[model samples]
Target: ASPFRLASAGEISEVQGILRTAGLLGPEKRIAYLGVLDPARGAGSEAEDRRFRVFIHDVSGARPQEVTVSVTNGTVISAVELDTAATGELPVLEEEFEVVEQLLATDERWLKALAARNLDVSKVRVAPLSAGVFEYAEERGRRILRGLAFVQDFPEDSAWAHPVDGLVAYVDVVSKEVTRVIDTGVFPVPAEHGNYTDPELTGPLRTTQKPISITQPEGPSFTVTGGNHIEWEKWSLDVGFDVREGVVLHNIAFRDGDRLRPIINRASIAEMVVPYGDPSPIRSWQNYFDTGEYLVGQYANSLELGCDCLGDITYLSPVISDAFGNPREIRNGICMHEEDWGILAKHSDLWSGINYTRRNRRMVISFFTTIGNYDYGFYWYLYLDGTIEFEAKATGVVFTSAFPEGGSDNISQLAPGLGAPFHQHIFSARLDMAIDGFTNRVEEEDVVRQTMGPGNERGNAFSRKRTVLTRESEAVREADARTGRTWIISNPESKNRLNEPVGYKLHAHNQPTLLADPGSSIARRAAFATKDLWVTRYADDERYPTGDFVNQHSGGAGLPSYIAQDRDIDGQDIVVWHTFGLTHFPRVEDWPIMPVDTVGFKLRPEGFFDRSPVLDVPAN
Candidate 1:
């Protein structure tokens, strides 16, 4: 064998070793003959300064499969499975090379023009021509092809060659540029919403005050509220709470089955509250932690009350109907803050601030969806006070296109035409809040209209004032669950104190009810469900009571008895919906772009946090 042959074999062996270490390759595969690239000058600079296209392949399997990886540094820039398949004709390969070269030439011309205009070029690098193949299928059917071309400034050490199927690809050490590509696509998600952009809702910033008393010192207490009876094939609500150190953490859930209650651990017991429904063992941390705040600001305190719902249990029924269609009742419950609850009880230390304004404080609510039928909202109260707040809201679903999965009342399919799979959670809704501060309070005295959903009475700009918020009614049926009693209340008579509570009355709205009959029209169901999803922005002064979208919707994965029951079809994916948007109701002073991150939201106690103080607890 030639010296080059030995070098290539060694490099191939090294590539296989890396793949095995990364858990991407099987041990039985052995390297045959390998090819190596010749080293070029200025190699180190090329390695540090180039971008390359990558390819992955499944060799020797029943079929040949291919995938692609984009690289800049040692890190992967992007990885995607090519949706197109290879024709197995090598003639196309030559054509692809020409096409890529043309594209690169065009890019080089563009870069040169930019340089003439004073653009920087020293740090720019491109690949003029490259291709990689990944083996995906069992035979010729599984093959994939990917190509890349760089600009004139492309790195010299960037080598080009397609690796054999089943072999891991990587940059040759001698090449000094992008030398290697690894295939590791089968890893499971260790956490929910692991995507970097996805929000990781954390508790408020500050330590919790120690609770004054602990009746059930077990772990957390569990309680049930709302209608006692359980309906068949429907949605029911459940809530969980923990009162530790003096702060209260709450979680609400709307589930499908019967039993009502959340599983509790005695050692971790603080205060757990459950609604009327079946009970489930609190297993995943995601479910229990959902009760905490979403998007706790830098100065905000967030505590995981334990339930992914974040205390909003509005989507339970719809979640169930999409799977089991059981008659379910929605319930709401909360845990009060005792004197001794401390923030450290939940393994975090942070300070949360509150804002007191003349008119209202700044607040923003957000939402999430799983499928299109049931869009849920999760509310977070950010303010000057140390305490965080929670609330829930419901938005009817938007279906993909057919029955079971395409009805306007159901969640959308994972992909465009895919049928309803238990794993899809793509729907979303939002609520933006604008509180009148002290200055605005004095300026707009009488029933100042602040945007709610989308209505004109509040100076909304939509062609037709969209109804964003509304009372509960049978027409507002939520899937298989019925809205019990709906009401709203806002306290405009400010006590001149920051702790004074002002908002709407507690109202339960009926959600769209799903019929068990197979003949039900999906369009009709979607139209009916859309009625309750009013996008109107309401005015505080026009209604009985009002403020902003402080508390909204809450939802997530796992089975909970308090709100959502144990329906097997709901699957294990977590779905959360909150509110997020802007209130254009600007004041004269808001101009000049406002201060940096000056706006905020808050959640005060509602009779629940009004208990005796626990002053003797030790502070960490």
Candidate 2:
């Protein structure tokens, strides 16, 4: 046995100083808990192999209450709630541990099963040990740990085991022979707000066959000066289309206007839900149905390919809206559709038998509030070349389940009563898209006016009393009622459809948090409430809308229209975060309720920009 030595007060102070300086001191501040192995102690390898648990009481205002953190190898394997009243400690609902153990065991059994089937196992080593946590870096320089834990293989054919607390490991673990597996589920006292889980609708999707490839145009040193002619940018490609199979393939495309268009579109996946209680009752539905989540059919030839240089083609412009009629700049951003994956973010009771199939490609690319409440819907633009684009429109949902108390005029209650019980109906809004796909090879003189028309009116027309167009004519007329509001007459010749309309809505239901006093004496409080309301709209709306969801007028703050940040694969970049529960206040009837669902859209990359457009440009 080795001689013992006591640690001095100065030595302990130095250690504490190091921890504080590194921002890892105590069970508060940056970290809620801390646990480590003492290599100098007589118990060496056991310290490395055994499990340790710590209950951290977070004092930070961002999150409240107790959290649990488990660790081994300085890496946290799991973090959970420390609901003291519930389990005396964090509940180790055997299932959690069972899943982890089974996953590891299954991995080992695969090797044996392969050998038994006479398959080669020479290339197999241990699977690169995953720390078993999703890591994300924080704005602060400190590394925030979330879930952490450890595991070890048992001897012979015995099953692997993990501890709820404390250490358990065999000393003579030398050979890489087949052994039992153990899985210590998540460690670390999960911070109060950190009890939330990140459920994504669009994840890594693998494709079998290569999508249609299009060739981009090269050259271009000069810029166009002016004029009013149609320009078409042509891309050559050798695309092989299977006649029988109609598959929705993901692809890439490049453009000169904005990179956001592609990123937002790609991020948007379709979400599907079948209504449990309703007018239309069906167990399942297909994509082509009008009631389906999205209208995904073959691209229309007129919209995608048709371009008449014979002065028929004209330009389209964006319409900016505001409450007080102040013209707002139409800033650029992305919009993803959100679909119901049938996972309850408010509850953790997962039913394994209710797992969805990968074959169900229906998903929604949508953005939610940090405290999800209201959701914004998006649609994809498919070009003549089979390329798609994504855009978002507000399709608001009522946040409060109850109407205002003793209210003279209740908008939420009255509107639902007036409308068809707040049906999930599809509202069409025509977007004034800027035509960017012009043919580079054609000269300005040869570029004739296809769908000819004057450019958009320039000015802040947010609160303007102007005539809404019924037809695209040189003579500006404002006589018809339908023509007074937004929208262009789709049928120019039809007398009955003379004053047709098209425009987006800032529907009352869209605002997740409805204010009782929107226009009240307490303006500042109302503004704060508005912000909170928007945030709630986001949180309750969708699973993930990291990028821009609503128009900038809504909640597009400093966050990019597109959130392009990456997540860490290791344990170094994890942080504790939270969002509100489904405080939308579901009724007792909502329980065992039917799934009322809708569809969403996404843009797929179609090999448009194979090479960098700004290759020669220097970083700003």
Candidate 3:
């Protein structure tokens, strides 16, 4: 249990103290992430287990050093300086944003650019974005952030509304040097304030919808033990938060009858790549690995009333390290509640026809993070019928650029002079599943149609094809709407009542993967997004879909590198990585504050349950 539990604040404090005293952390060094190491990576006794994984950017280096430490005994386990330059760089810290503003205030190039457009430097906000890898000498192997400037007329005005587009300022984050500021000619700032809550847009509230309220009479059906283990209905999973992965569920199992059946060993929203469609130099280098490059969970928004969540909710406070190496609490960082999902099952007898109905409910665990212009909601659902679902909701303002009256195909006009660029939000979910035990196998299942002969003489006959994926290389696949393909994860050692291997089915909607062309920078860097499904034999360190170091990474790592091993997965412990996302071409209605667009996948009990798991659910 200790190995599976989330690190406590006291543990974080202790680790922080030990690292500083050991000279691994200093006044100038910055921490990118600190969390418990996966139990599989541990060694020997529980005391000697891999307890903590810490990433810190030392004063002398641009890349973050990955440190392995044990919490039980104050010992530095191992150290790897990510000297693989192309695959390493530190995520931007909040303090750097302030420093960037100050670094630009007095710079003649930035000052002149602002003056030419009659804009004050103080009112302008700059986005410190990852300089997606390029052949430029200065940006190579250096901690560089490509800052895009924006203007804000009022204090509360959204900086995203007015794009001071064309101005790209390159900054060496650690050195505080403004290497160069490229001005591709200035465009006029958009005319109006892009505020959804502005008086003009919110003058009169709509009276169409009535107020609704929800209350839990006897409180929620969930309990948290030691602030990390969650038990709701028949589902039990350890809830964890990582500075980069946001919400992580560990040791997930469901209580069927007297036995607690193992489902997924661990699962989380791994990484995201948002690639803009604009081809100009100002926007071409616009692909971003939001989770890896920015540590979105570090900037997580506190869940509260309104759209954040509803009903009787329980919140989990996640603690992250501040720049000075101390614990900082993100209030209400994780939201857990029960959502009514309408009908679970319903049927009616032939003519006698007495309708039978069963209600459906799901336990939701979620968190929201605002990286810059966009906000993402990571939601995990456990249903009454033994199903696990992952959903990511994208909201907030779209990235805007100044445009002519009518925008081009790549840009959607939001206002007369403002437009949002076409881009995609591709999210990857890493599900480490163990259906009933550690050793398992996967089979690809696709619907097929047969010719009207013999067994298919009826002409309407169709069949299903099941193929076992024997090795990692043969496991990469794409979703096919035409064939309705799905993947089945099975535990070869565990058998059901019908003597079939107990299993769970993976279901994913047919959606576009990364649209960036092959051999392109984003294509190489985000190769994991090129496929809908990937299965690999479970390895302790193979956690993130994009590998360990993603900031300015050059590619040839993560999934591509993992499968090159082409390890045999038959009857072995395996991990599944599914890429699901939305390829959004911005619409006029998605302006100011865009409505939430969701994408995700599901895992349902296939032969794992002999009977209906929801039979115990009673009438309301």
**Which candidate achieves the best TM-score against the true structure?**
3
Q: How close is candidate 2 to the true structure, as a TM-score?
A: 0.21
lDDT of 3 at 498: 95
How do the predictions measure up, each by TM-score? Answer: 0.21, 0.21, 0.96
Runs in model 2 deviating more than 4 A are 1-21, 24-26, 30-516, 520-594, 597-620
lDDT minimum window of 10 residues, candidate 2: 438-447
Better of 2 and 3 by lDDT: 3
Two-way lDDT contest, 1 vs 3, winner: 3
Predicted candidate 1 versus true structure: per-residue lDDT over 439-531, tens digit per residue = 011000112235645555556532212121222121122211221222212223322235653222222223222222333222121122122
lDDT ranking, best first: 3, 1, 2
Best-fitting candidate, scored by lDDT: 3
List the lowest-lDDT window of 10 residues for candidate 3.
Answer: 41-50
List ranges where model 1 is wrong by over 4 Å.
1-106, 123-576, 582-595, 598-620
Better of 1 and 3 by TM-score: 3
lDDT of 3 by residue, 1-620 (tens): 45666666777888888787677887667777777877663333555454788888766654468888786888888877777475666676777666777788888999998899899888999887888887787677777788888888889988888898778888877778899888988787897887777779768878899877888999998998977888988998999888888888998999988998889988987889999998868888998898888887888999876567889989989887776668889999899999889999998989886888999999999999998888988999999999889888999889988775545778778887887888999988898888887879999999988888887677998889989999998999988888989999998899999999999999997799988888799998889899999999988878788888888778867898999899999999899999988989888888878898898899888989998888889888
RMSD of 3: 1.9
